[PDB]
Amino acid sequence: DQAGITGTWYNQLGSTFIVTAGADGALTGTYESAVGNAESRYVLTGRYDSAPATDGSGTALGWTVAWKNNYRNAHSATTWSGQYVGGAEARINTQWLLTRGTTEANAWESTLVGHDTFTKV
Amino acid sequence: DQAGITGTWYNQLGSTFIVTAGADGALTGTYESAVGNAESRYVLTGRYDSAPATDGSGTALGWTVAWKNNYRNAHSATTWSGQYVGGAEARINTQWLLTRGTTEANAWESTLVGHDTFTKV
Amino acid sequence: DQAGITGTWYNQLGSTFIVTAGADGALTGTYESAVGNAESRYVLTGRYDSAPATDGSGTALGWTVAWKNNYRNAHSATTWSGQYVGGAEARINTQWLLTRGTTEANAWESTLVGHDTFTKV
Amino acid sequence: DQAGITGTWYNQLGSTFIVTAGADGALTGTYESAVGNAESRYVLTGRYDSAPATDGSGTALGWTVAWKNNYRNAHSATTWSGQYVGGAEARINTQWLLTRGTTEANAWESTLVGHDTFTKV
């Protein structure tokens, strides 16, 4: 699924996820968020299962973006955990955790959770 | 916090997280899980906020492990999202999402969620 | 939104959520899961914001199902946290946590996370 | 575990959870949050597995609080999903989702996630 995953993906928010899958399981690229006071591209890295089950299962993957680039610093990071589903309409189906740097007093509200679905169009 | 983060961390399960923080926000290293039929070291990559708030806030970070190495393939990936808290007892406080590759029929039960706290001892 | 919420809802899995919203913020009813070896109806209870913002915001709500009825006992419970969005196509948009009773040794894999979207058709 | 669960519990934040477990699986009571601009008691309802496994497993449960009482309205709701662990030091180990009522434009940041551990002291 190296070629399956490599490319440009869009989620339901209009965000842009540009990734290369390495033969070794690497994910590298850039993320551009349509929401959350992000601007321009942010580095992302992650991993995927480079030898997935042959049984019709999705391919497990995740990646991280720290929301610091030359334009802005949100003092936060998102991880997306999900699976690549190949075929007519290839999807990456994810759930994500965004942790903001906080004081101990605000640690309880440090983390947002959501779900993003990525498509090739 | 590059030096703060770089090193060997342990969670409440006896898992071992070995990471280097790059000046550019990179996280690279290896993870060894004490649970979940993992064996030996797995590659991890992630990101951290290399220019955190100066106001006593934690430093946002996350990373990914795909559970494939030369020993095993769980057909899964975990992301940890959290923050590094410096000082006497440095912590990485995380929440995690583990996605298993599944069929569409099992996609609803694809994802586990938990929380790991990492200490330097 | 008492009348808005009261009724029969379906999620993307074909599950059936039958709820009454009380004037006091109560949610009571039954859930029938199309997946996960559930059979027939299970009691649910929850709460909703009976005096929501007037500013176009959704109405916050959640509810719990313990997966025990006269037919089966999964030794588990799901909570759905989300918001009711009124209008042409009323939705309840949720995220959920399913905790299984486990031993301490399996506590780390106790909890599944997902997202369900409920519609009136 | 009806008697096990019934009582007054405290989490790591100094919050107060007062619950009665019904013979029928009901949870009813009040929650007082030490954080998050909550004041005084809020109604909670939930469910627990009234016939748990006999094998040393925890007892699955969850409950909901909508953050409206006579003092305040946060336009939000939290669900706690977890398990009751009996014995010398009885615990309720939970993970929680807090959904705020939002506009569609802010729906992506509607939901906070955390973990609370409740003890009888």
From Swiss-Prot, chains A, B, C, D:
Family the UniProt entry places it in: Belongs to the avidin/streptavidin family.
Organism: Streptomyces avidinii
GO cellular component, one term: extracellular region
Motif (Cell attachment site): 47-49
Name recorded for this polypeptide: Streptavidin
Function statement: The biological function of streptavidin is not known. Forms a strong non-covalent specific complex with biotin (one molecule of biotin per subunit of streptavidin).
Subcellular location: Secreted
Lineage, top ranks: Bacteria, Bacillati, Actinomycetota, Actinomycetes, Kitasatosporales
Binding site for biotin: 31, 42, 80, 96, 108
Main subcellular location: secreted
Whole-protein coverage range: 39 to 157 of 183
Domain of life of the organism encoding this protein: Bacteria
Subunit structure, as described in the record: Homotetramer.
